[PDB]
Every structure is written in structure tokens, then in C-alpha cells.
Design an enzyme around this catalytic site. Sequence first.
Site, mmCIF file in Angstrom:
data_model
loop_
_atom_site.group_PDB
_atom_site.id
_atom_site.type_symbol
_atom_site.label_atom_id
_atom_site.label_comp_id
_atom_site.label_asym_id
_atom_site.label_seq_id
_atom_site.Cartn_x
_atom_site.Cartn_y
_atom_site.Cartn_z
ATOM 1 N N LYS A 17 0.653 -1.255 0.087
ATOM 2 C CA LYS A 17 0.133 0.076 -0.150
ATOM 3 C C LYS A 17 0.804 1.070 -0.046
ATOM 4 O O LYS A 17 1.886 1.209 0.697
ATOM 5 C CB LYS A 17 -0.822 0.124 1.144
ATOM 6 C CG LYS A 17 -1.920 -1.198 1.243
ATOM 7 C CD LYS A 17 -2.785 -0.931 2.649
ATOM 8 C CE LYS A 17 -4.097 -1.946 2.505
ATOM 9 N NZ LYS A 17 -4.821 -1.586 3.820
ATOM 10 N N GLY A 62 -8.509 5.075 -1.039
ATOM 11 C CA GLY A 62 -9.740 4.599 -1.897
ATOM 12 C C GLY A 62 -8.973 3.328 -2.842
ATOM 13 O O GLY A 62 -9.702 3.383 -3.772
ATOM 14 N N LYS A 112 -0.447 -7.815 6.214
ATOM 15 C CA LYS A 112 -1.152 -8.950 5.980
ATOM 16 C C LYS A 112 -2.638 -8.808 5.332
ATOM 17 O O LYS A 112 -3.513 -7.988 5.656
ATOM 18 C CB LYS A 112 -1.485 -9.575 7.550
ATOM 19 C CG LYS A 112 -2.251 -10.951 7.390
ATOM 20 C CD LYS A 112 -1.436 -12.031 6.909
ATOM 21 C CE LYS A 112 -2.101 -13.355 7.172
ATOM 22 N NZ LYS A 112 -1.267 -14.661 6.679
ATOM 23 N N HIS A 155 -14.488 -0.266 -4.501
ATOM 24 C CA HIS A 155 -14.067 0.812 -3.477
ATOM 25 C C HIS A 155 -14.899 1.883 -3.342
ATOM 26 O O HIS A 155 -14.764 2.901 -3.194
ATOM 27 C CB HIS A 155 -12.494 1.211 -3.658
ATOM 28 C CG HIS A 155 -11.640 0.103 -3.835
ATOM 29 N ND1 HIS A 155 -11.297 -0.585 -2.444
ATOM 30 C CD2 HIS A 155 -11.008 -0.427 -4.888
ATOM 31 C CE1 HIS A 155 -10.377 -1.369 -3.006
ATOM 32 N NE2 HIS A 155 -10.094 -1.469 -4.374
ATOM 33 N N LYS A 161 -18.664 2.774 -1.764
ATOM 34 C CA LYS A 161 -20.031 1.836 -1.003
ATOM 35 C C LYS A 161 -21.199 2.360 -1.627
ATOM 36 O O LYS A 161 -21.287 3.258 -2.519
ATOM 37 C CB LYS A 161 -19.906 2.855 0.361
ATOM 38 C CG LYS A 161 -18.665 2.661 1.385
ATOM 39 C CD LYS A 161 -18.699 3.605 2.573
ATOM 40 C CE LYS A 161 -17.384 3.576 3.238
ATOM 41 N NZ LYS A 161 -16.314 3.758 2.272
ATOM 42 N N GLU A 172 -11.591 3.646 10.342
ATOM 43 C CA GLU A 172 -12.019 2.638 9.559
ATOM 44 C C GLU A 172 -11.374 1.554 10.053
ATOM 45 O O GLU A 172 -10.039 1.254 10.264
ATOM 46 C CB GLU A 172 -11.904 2.973 8.095
ATOM 47 C CG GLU A 172 -12.729 4.026 7.469
ATOM 48 C CD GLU A 172 -12.400 4.047 6.027
ATOM 49 O OE1 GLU A 172 -11.912 2.917 5.490
ATOM 50 O OE2 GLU A 172 -12.717 4.792 5.480
ATOM 51 N N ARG A 217 -12.928 14.046 8.456
ATOM 52 C CA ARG A 217 -13.952 14.758 7.868
ATOM 53 C C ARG A 217 -15.396 13.986 8.264
ATOM 54 O O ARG A 217 -15.293 12.862 8.805
ATOM 55 C CB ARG A 217 -14.013 14.759 6.240
ATOM 56 C CG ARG A 217 -13.927 13.328 5.735
ATOM 57 C CD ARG A 217 -13.857 13.259 3.970
ATOM 58 N NE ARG A 217 -14.227 11.945 3.748
ATOM 59 C CZ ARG A 217 -13.417 10.971 3.323
ATOM 60 N NH1 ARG A 217 -12.256 11.313 3.821
ATOM 61 N NH2 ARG A 217 -13.641 9.811 2.969
HETATM 62 N N1 LIG Z 1 -4.515 -5.643 4.732
HETATM 63 C C1 LIG Z 1 -5.849 -5.438 3.896
HETATM 64 N N2 LIG Z 1 -6.590 -6.389 3.887
HETATM 65 C C2 LIG Z 1 -7.713 -6.352 3.236
HETATM 66 C C3 LIG Z 1 -8.331 -5.042 2.688
HETATM 67 C C4 LIG Z 1 -9.173 -4.796 2.068
HETATM 68 C C5 LIG Z 1 -9.728 -3.601 1.642
HETATM 69 C C6 LIG Z 1 -10.910 -3.319 1.139
HETATM 70 C C7 LIG Z 1 -11.196 -3.902 -0.386
HETATM 71 C C8 LIG Z 1 -12.321 -3.533 -0.876
HETATM 72 C C9 LIG Z 1 -13.432 -3.074 -0.400
HETATM 73 C C10 LIG Z 1 -13.244 -2.473 0.996
HETATM 74 C C11 LIG Z 1 -11.965 -2.617 1.763
HETATM 75 C C12 LIG Z 1 -8.587 -2.260 2.032
HETATM 76 N N3 LIG Z 1 -9.085 -1.019 1.675
HETATM 77 C C13 LIG Z 1 -9.251 -0.503 0.579
HETATM 78 C C14 LIG Z 1 -9.272 0.916 0.739
HETATM 79 C C15 LIG Z 1 -8.425 1.166 1.956
HETATM 80 C C16 LIG Z 1 -8.813 -0.048 2.667
HETATM 81 N N4 LIG Z 1 -7.568 -2.638 2.784
HETATM 82 C C17 LIG Z 1 -7.292 -3.935 3.156
HETATM 83 N N5 LIG Z 1 -6.021 -4.182 3.924
HETATM 84 CL CL LIG Z 2 -17.065 10.206 2.678
#
Ligand SMILES: Nc1ncc2cc(-c3ccccc3)c(N3CC=CC3)nc2n1
Ligand SMILES: [Cl-]
EC number: 6.3.4.14
Length: 446
Positions: free
Chosen positions: A159, A165, A202, A236, A238, A276, A292
Amino acid sequence: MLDKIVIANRGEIALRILRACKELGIKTVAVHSSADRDLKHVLLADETVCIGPAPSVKSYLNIPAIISAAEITGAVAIHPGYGFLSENANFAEQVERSGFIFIGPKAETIRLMGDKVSAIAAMKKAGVPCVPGSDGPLGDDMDKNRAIAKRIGYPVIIKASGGGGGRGMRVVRGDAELAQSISMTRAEAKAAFSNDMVYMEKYLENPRHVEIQVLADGQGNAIYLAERDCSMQRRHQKVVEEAPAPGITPELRRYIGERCAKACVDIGYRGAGTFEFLFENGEFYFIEMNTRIQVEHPVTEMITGVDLIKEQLRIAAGQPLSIKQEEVHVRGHAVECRINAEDPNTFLPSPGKITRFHAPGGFGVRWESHIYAGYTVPPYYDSMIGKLICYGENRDVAIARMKNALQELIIDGIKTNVDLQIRIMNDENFQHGGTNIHYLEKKLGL
Ligand SMILES: Nc1ncc2cc(-c3ccccc3)c(N3CC=CC3)nc2n1
Ligand SMILES: [Cl-]
């Protein structure tokens, strides 16, 4: 109380903020693009300023123009809404520098939470559970990087630290893909955020997206207002949000909420905020913090009685939180369906003129939208044109109210996701509750 504020936003959130201001007797300045002259909130505002042409770079992201409007109108504060400049720390800094109140945290706090590596280290330090990860930026040493991945355990995810997003992040399931994945995520991070910093976590295969709402004032008070489940999503974005999250016990709510409020105190947080989390196997894992107010804030309002936008304005005026933690109680259940002017087959924005409009009504039904009959959805901005929020004494009543409300909603002349929302409400797995972040895309794939 604040005399006059600029609403540095558009569409539904600008009307949401305008109503809150009016309730509090706050004079309103609507700044708008030339494409947004006939917005409902612009039409209801005490003063209006056109700040530039249609494209956002010259309007809603135009820092000098928004500051000048605050200056020329004698406004004392700026509410950034969500999106646009709400997470822009340089903007918030400029606002305060220019002598106006920024309705949000300090710029330092925005900048802290806008850096995902530093934000994680702060939460982990404060006692918030995070995803097992590198606990630091990844270097160029691939022997180290393979060691960190072995330590964590595959699958892992790479990341960008300055990103958000899901933009530029890749899952790695073995050593063979690690070097290339890091390199590409890094390159995409440099191109998009001018920050090539990356980290490792992870990878959680099937979690839920569960977030905690907080409020913190300038008197040392910091509270949590339960959680939202935002797992019903696509790419990504909602689609449905609900409060509280199904399966979450008061004990879990207490456990994670107290840790979030504690984190706020440690970092000296101010205003509305959202922690989150990925929720999997009964466990919470912090991923990022939004400083925000968010799109989905209304479902939290329905279950607690707390008007979150009014709390923002009170906090900014130097007033304490109007409620205490022991006064916050989760009552009933709320569901939000996002309404998008979008094509059903492409999911691309579908702008155009609304020829016939009818909003739903009834007990527990809340319609959050600027749209009306005759209104043209401009092509220049986001596809979300409205929010339908339905509350009931339990989840089933909220879902039942949603279905009925979706069937009263008429928006002709443009394409919408109303039919899709109806499909999701009638989905047996949604009706059961607790579906993961991948469910909708799997359902649409079938
Ligand atoms: N280490 C992880 N594992 C799964 C994830 C799913 C994630 C995810 C994928 C699709 C929809 C919501 C969250 C996600 N994000 C995407 C936006 C930032 C957090 N981050 C993650 N990190
Ligand atoms: Cl928002």
C-alpha cells in the site's frame, strides 16, 4: 455561535450543512461553480458567490477563490464537507493562516492521518488494534522485503502511504510477485501522490468494513457513536451502509469504541472523525482514519439521536459536546442506500435532466438530496445525487421501510441505481446480514 460560514461544497452535503446552519441561526454563504447556480442549497443560501467555472480545479478545489469568498462576505468559518478539500491539510492550514475557522481537526492532525504509515504508528501506540504489517516504510532491499513478508505471512498487501480509496495497492501471494508488486505500487504512488512511500500488511481475504464514528471537542471530551457496516460495495465505492453493524455485541462495541475515543485524546483530535476497520473472525483491524464528516453519517444520526453536523459547528465555535458518552445509546437500526445517476450496465456516471421527481415519505424515512423536477445533473462531478435513509426499531423494519421507499422514489429523465438497490434489499444474504466486502461484486458477477 458562529455568525456566518462558507459551505465549501456542493450537492447533497452542502444542503445537509445548510440545514444544520439554519437550525443554529448561522448565516450561510454558498460558494458554487457556474454549473451549480441552480443547486437547491445555493437557492436557499443567505449569500452566494460564484467561485469559478465548472471544472473543480477552478471551483471547489480553488483554494484562493474559496478563501476570497469568505473574506468578501465576512464569513468566519469554512465547512469543507466531504471530498474536495476536506482532507487537504495545506488548505486547512491556509484557512486558519488567513484567520478563518476550518470546521475540522488541526491541519497537523489531518496531515498525520493522511499519512497512512504515521497514522498506523499513532494508533498502534494509542492502543488501537491494527493489521499485522511492516510497521514502517518498505525500502529497496528485497531480501528485507521477503523477510518482512515471511514474518507477516502470505498473502500480503502493498500500500501507498499517501494514498486512499484502493488506488495503487496490490495483493502478493508469494515471493515471485513481491519485487514487481512493490515496484509498481511505488511507481503509481509517486505518479499520483508525489510520495513513493509504501508499506506492507497481512492481506485479509474476506473481512467486513466496519467503522467507528467519533466526536471530539476543544474541552477534552471525546466520544464514540457506535459503528457503521459499509461492506456492501463495488470497486471501492460504498453502495449500502447500515448502523449498527449486524453481529456486533455491546461488548465489542464498547471494546473498540473506547479504544478509538482514547486514541482521539492521545492525538488531540477535534471535530467529527471516523476510524475505519477491517473486521474478520470477531477481530478489529485499523486501516485508516477519515478526519471529515462522511457520506454515510446519517445512519449513525438515526440510531443515536445525535446531529453530527450541528456537533461539528458547535465544536468549531468552542462549545463542548452537547452529550456525554453514558448518554449515547444505540437505539433501533438504520440503512442507507446511495442513489447514483449512473448507467446500469457500465456503472459510469449518467448525467442529464431530471424530468419527473418524487421523493418517498413516511415514518422512519429520510431523504437527503438536492435534486428536484427540472434539475440537470452536471457531468463534472460525482454520480451520487441522493441518499435514502430508513430507520426502524430493528434491522428488518429498516429493510422493509427501505424497499417501500425505493418503490415510491421516482427519478425519470436519467438512469439510476434504484433498481439495483431494490435488488440488494431483496437479497437473501443481505437480509440475513453480515456479508463481506466482496459480496456485491460476486452477486453482480453471477
Ligand atoms: N490488509 C488489508 N486486507 C484487506 C483489505 C481490504 C480492503 C478493501 C477492499 C475492498 C473494499 C473495502 C476494503 C482495504 N482497503 C481499500 C481501501 C482502503 C482499505 N484494505 C485492506 N487491507
Ligand atoms: Cl465520505
